[PDB]
Amino acid sequence: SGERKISRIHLVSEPSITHFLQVSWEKTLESGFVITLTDGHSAWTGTVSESEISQEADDMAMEKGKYVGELRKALLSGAGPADVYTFNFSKESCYFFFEKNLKDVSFRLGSFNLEKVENPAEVIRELICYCLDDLSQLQTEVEEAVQECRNAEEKAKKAITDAAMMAEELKKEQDTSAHLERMKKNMEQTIKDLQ
Amino acid sequence: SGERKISRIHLVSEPSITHFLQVSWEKTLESGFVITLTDGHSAWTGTVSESEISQEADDMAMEKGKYVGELRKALLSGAGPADVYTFNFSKESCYFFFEKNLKDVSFRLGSFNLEKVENPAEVIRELICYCLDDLSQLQTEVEEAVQECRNAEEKAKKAITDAAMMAEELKKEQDTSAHLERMKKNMEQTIKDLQH
Fold this sequence. Notes:
Chain B: Residues 3-133 are annotated as: Interaction with IFFO1. Two copies of one chain form a homodimer. The first copy, chain A, is built from three helices and eight strands. By secondary structure, chain A is an alpha+beta fold. The longest helix of chain A is centred in the C-terminal third of the chain and has 74 residues, at 120-193. The interface between A and B is large, with 56 and 56 residues.
């Protein structure tokens, strides 16, 4: 099996409508991935090999592991902290390239050539089926995460009860010790006056 | 205040292609809903009013509550293996009717009069956007539960650390008490020797 990530993007040439990007890989995005773009009517598909990823990461002076982290933020929709990414696609040449905006820099991150799919309806139906499967998967993870929260709250409740009983036993013992010291002081007086 | 449910269905006339049924309503399903059917290329939409739902329950001689329960299982994917529902759609008439299947028989539960949407791509894009909105909301619900789980683990660690500190103090106090009772044993014996 593999892993996917379906994301919304807005093309620079078409800011009015929303496009959808589907990226799928095997174990890591670093070993290559298939990328599919659709507008709800047509679909375009491309493949990026591991060699192309290592080469594009080398055309720019950039550690390869760090470059994959930029692909994940750009193509897998993980760039929340005030990052600006742009996506460009010509439906006449099928050339897709994306850039990263900093301070009017807009430097190129990567690019690939897509191809118009002859069965867009089947690709779109497959995309909707994964979203529905991902919704059912994520609903069970909500219930499991809520159950883990209640299990931890009961473990915290037990830990607080045990700490309170621990304090109670410490109080009793230092009271016992202080009372024994008074008995010792009394017996030392009994010994002192028996002489 | 609108709710929505998107389900995978298979039409009787097209078993090899998966269709999608989008049901949206406002207050309750009983008060009327909107149907959208798509195959990834085309889209058909229609509306069912509260009066038509009540009329369909009357046509089947059952109380509206039990009929709406059947609507919920057939149209909102609220059915298990004990309930089987089939779906029929003719692209020429745009007439959609669904049935319940028991043993070797089937009977009508309801129907919609759909119409082909002239801009299905916008309908399909809006449907996918909703699924991605729902995925993001469930993602935050996991992160909120995981965070509340971490908050409970921090309270436990503090209580465990506090208890362990008091546990070592208890042992120190117990050793002090045992030392005092040993002196208490010696002094009580020397007291009896001074008495004798």
